[PDB]
Structures are given as C-alpha cells and as structure tokens.
Enzyme design. Structure first.
Site, short mmCIF file in Angstrom:
data_model
loop_
_atom_site.label_atom_id
_atom_site.label_comp_id
_atom_site.label_asym_id
_atom_site.label_seq_id
_atom_site.Cartn_x
_atom_site.Cartn_y
_atom_site.Cartn_z
N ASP A 54 6.91 -2.91 -13.88
CA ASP A 54 6.94 -3.62 -12.58
C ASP A 54 7.70 -4.93 -12.64
O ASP A 54 7.12 -6.01 -12.52
CB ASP A 54 5.52 -3.85 -12.02
CG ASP A 54 5.53 -4.47 -10.62
OD1 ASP A 54 6.33 -4.02 -9.78
OD2 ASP A 54 4.73 -5.40 -10.38
N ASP A 61 2.73 -10.39 -11.63
CA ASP A 61 2.08 -9.17 -11.16
C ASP A 61 1.45 -8.39 -12.33
O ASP A 61 1.45 -7.16 -12.33
CB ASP A 61 3.13 -8.27 -10.47
CG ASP A 61 3.92 -9.00 -9.39
OD1 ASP A 61 3.31 -9.44 -8.40
OD2 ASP A 61 5.16 -9.13 -9.54
N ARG A 117 -2.59 -1.63 -13.15
CA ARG A 117 -1.75 -0.68 -12.40
C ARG A 117 -0.27 -0.82 -12.74
O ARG A 117 0.50 0.09 -12.48
CB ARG A 117 -1.96 -0.83 -10.90
CG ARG A 117 -1.50 -2.16 -10.33
CD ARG A 117 -1.85 -2.31 -8.86
NE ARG A 117 -1.29 -3.56 -8.34
CZ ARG A 117 -1.78 -4.77 -8.57
NH1 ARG A 117 -2.88 -4.93 -9.29
NH2 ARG A 117 -1.18 -5.84 -8.06
N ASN A 118 0.14 -1.96 -13.30
CA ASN A 118 1.53 -2.21 -13.68
C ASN A 118 1.77 -2.10 -15.16
O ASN A 118 2.79 -2.56 -15.67
CB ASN A 118 1.98 -3.57 -13.16
CG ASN A 118 2.08 -3.60 -11.65
OD1 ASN A 118 2.36 -2.57 -11.02
ND2 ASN A 118 1.83 -4.75 -11.05
#
Length: 280
Positions: free
Chosen positions: A163, A145, A149-150
């Site tokens: 994350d 992932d 955004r992480n």
C-alpha cells in the site's frame, strides 16, 4: 533516502508484455482490475506475480495516481517490502506487476485461522513487518497507512509491507497532521494488537470521535486473549502519548529478536470488549 516523486522509469523497469501472462482474475481495484499470473524474467526464469491494470478510459489524474504507487514502491528493495517487478506503460492497458503473495492480506488471513498459530509463528510475522518498517523509516518514508490490511503474507508466512485511518493513526497525527516515523511506530503497535487478536478490528466499531477522545484520555486497546506480557508491554510502548518515548523500529526488531531467541519469555502471559486506562 526516499525521494518524493515524471520518473516512473527512474525506479520501475518497463516490462515487455510478451513476458506477462494472466492466470486468474481477482476482481476490481481502485484504478481497474486486479489479477495474478506469471512473469518471464530476462534470464528465462518464470515467477508468479500480482498484476493490476489501469481501467480503459482512465483520466490523466488516474494514470498519475496509479503509476505513482510504482514510483514509490520501486525505491525500496527489502525482503519485507512488497517487490515491484515493473510496469507496462508502452502498451495499454497500463500495468503494475508486483510480488505474488499467496495468502493475501494479513488481517483476513488471520481471521480465517483464529487461534491456530503458535506464538512464535505470530512473532515471526511481526518481526518481518518491523524489519520492513525499519528500512522504510531508514529511508525517511513515513507510510501513514500501516495496518494489517496493508500487510501481505506469502506461502511461507513471510509478511511484507504494501500500500504505497483514525484507528491506526497516532494522536498527534490526528490532532494536527504530525506524521513522523514515530507515528508509524504507533500504527505498528496497532498492527501488533491486530496480529495477536487474529485480525480483530482495532477499537471494534466505536464511533470515530470516541476512538479519538478515549485514546487522548489515556485509554488503550486491552490485551488480546492469552497475550504474552512482553508483547502487550510492547504495544503500550508503541502507544506512548509522547512520540519521543516510543521505541524506534530498530529497537522493535531487537525486542522481537530477543523473544524469538528466548521463547520461554513468551510464557509470561498478561494478567489478564472495553478499553483500559493506561498511566504509563
């Protein structure tokens, strides 16, 4: 080596809730509330922390999945991986306490500051991310992932992996779930594009089936505006169809370190939206 997970206490400190204070409620999370505050360490030092709680009336599955984050995060100790300060399990609500990151998620931060950083600042962000990923891959942990955004960014612009997604996933991982550190390198290439694009969404809002097909046909995200040639080439290298031809994270860190040491190299701009067909 990373060990796939009852032992949250194998890798997480049980914190005394007396040492935790809440200063600001951020909002809702997947498993409960998200807030920030202060932690008093055993030495009496006080630090800012991010805090997450498990919702009241949680299911046992929710508790397991929530704390599972800590069982993973707590195995890592690296400046570019979000630090786990500890957990609270012996009183409710259950908590996970992590490193405070003043500037939040990297994608949203960059969108607020479009074209406002120097190329060397952006490269420093990217080098930090690559260094964190070199450590994760050294530990045998495949993130799966990795996306802007992480990544969280602190007051000094240091970026850290958090994350513990078709647009970020390598073609072979999409095709038959072949997840390896080389599929994380693919994702890193997407993050590189996100950073140089100031938080633009990879492949914009293309139909997912078209993202899959276009990438398979050899199409790639185009160079961000004013992107150094060296950085667009690095993206293309991370996006090699053959996973064995992608650079290792150690190589990515070295590439970025060379660019930092020879900042004039960044002045060579790619020559110079829609996707570009890339044969090699």
């Amino acid at each position: 080596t990373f060990v796939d997970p009852q032992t949250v206490h194998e890798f997480a400190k049980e914190l005394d809730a007396t040492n935790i204070s809440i200063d600001k409620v951020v909002g809702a999370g997947e498993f409960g509330e998200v807030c920030s505050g202060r932690l008093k360490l055993p030495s009496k030092k006080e630090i800012s922390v991010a805090i997450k709680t498990l919702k009241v009336g949680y299911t046992e599955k929710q508790r397991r999945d929530f704390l599972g984050e800590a069982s993973i995060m707590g195995q890592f100790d690296h400046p570019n991986i979000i630090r786990l300060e500890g957990v609270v399990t012996k009183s409710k609500p259950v908590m996970i306490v992590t490193e405070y990151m003043e500037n939040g998620s990297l994608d949203s931060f960059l969108r607020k500051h479009d074209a406002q950083f120097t190329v060397i600042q952006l490269v420093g962000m990217l080098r930090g991310i690559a260094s964190g990923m070199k450590y994760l891959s050294d530990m045998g942990y495949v993130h799966r992932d990795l996306a802007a955004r992480n990544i969280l960014i602190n007051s000094n612009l240091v970026c850290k992996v958090s994350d513990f997604p078709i647009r970020w996933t390598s073609p072979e991982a999409i095709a038959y779930r072949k997840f390896t550190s080389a599929s994380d390198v693919w994702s890193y290439g997407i993050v590189l594009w996100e950073v140089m694009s100031y938080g633009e969404r990879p492949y914009w809002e293309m139909s997912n089936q078209d993202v899959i097909k276009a990438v398979d046909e050899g199409y790639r995200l185009p160079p961000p505006m004013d992107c150094p040639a060296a950085l667009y080439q690095l993206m293309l290298d991370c996006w090699q169809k053959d996973r064995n031809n992608r650079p290792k994270f150690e190589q990515i860190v070295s590439i970025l370190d060379k660019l930092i040491r020879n900042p004039g190299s960044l002045k060579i701009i790619t020559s110079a939206s829609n996707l570009l067909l890339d044969q090699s």
